[PDB]
C-alpha cells in the first residue's frame, strides 16, 4: 500500500493557485496602474504650473 | 523638480519695462523740450530787448 502517497499528490495537484496571484495581478495592476501614475507625475508639476501661473 | 525656477524666470522675462522708461521719454522729452527751452533762453533777453527799448 502506497496510495495515500498518491492521494496527497493529487491534493498537491489540485493547487490553490493562490489568491497571491490575482491579488498580485491586482498589484501587478498596481505596477502598471503605477505606470499610469508615473505618467501623472509629469503632469503634477505641469498642471500645477498652469494652476500657479 | 525645478520648474518653479523656470516659472520665476518667465516672470522675470515678462518684464515690466518700467513706466520709468516712458515717463522718462517724457523726461527725455523734458531734456529736448529743454533743448527748445534753451533756445528760448536766447530770445528771453532779445524779446525783452525789443520790449524794453
Swiss-Prot record, chains A, B:
The chain crosses the membrane at residues 1-21. The pili are polar flexible filaments of about 5.4 nanometers diameter and 2.5 micrometers average length; they consist of only a single polypeptide chain arranged in a helical configuration of five subunits per turn in the assembled pilus. The lineage of its organism: Bacteria, Pseudomonadati, Pseudomonadota, Betaproteobacteria, Neisseriales. Belongs to the N-Me-Phe pilin family. The O-linked glycan identified as Gal-GlcNAc disaccharide in PubMed:7477282 and PubMed:10048019 is now identified as either a hexosyl-diacetamidotrideoxyhexoside (DATDHex) by mass spectrometry in PubMed:15249686, or alpha-D-galactopyranosyl-(1->3)-2,4-diacetamido-2,4-dideoxy-beta-D-glucopyranoside (DADDGlc) by X-ray diffraction in PubMed:16949362. It is not clear whether there is a chemical difference in the glycosylation of the two derivatives of strain MS11 used in these experiments, or not. GO terms for biological process: cell adhesion. Keywords: Cell adhesion, Disulfide bond, Fimbrium, Glycoprotein, Membrane, Methylation, Phosphoprotein, Transmembrane, Transmembrane helix. Major component of the type IV pilus (T4P) that plays a role in cellular adherence, microcolony formation, resistance to neutrophil mediated killing, twitching motility as well as transformation. Mediates the attachment and the formation of bacterial microcolonies on host epithelial cells. Mechanistically, pili retractation induces host NF-kappa-B activation in infected cells, which is temporally associated with the formation of gonococcal microcolonies. The keyword Disulfide bond applies. This is Type IV major pilin protein PilE1. The modification N-methylphenylalanine is found at residue 1. It is found in: Fimbrium; Membrane. One of its GO terms (cellular component) is membrane. The gene is pilE1. Disruption phenotype: Deletion mutants show a complete absence of observable pili. The chain holds residues 8 to 60 of 165 of the full protein.
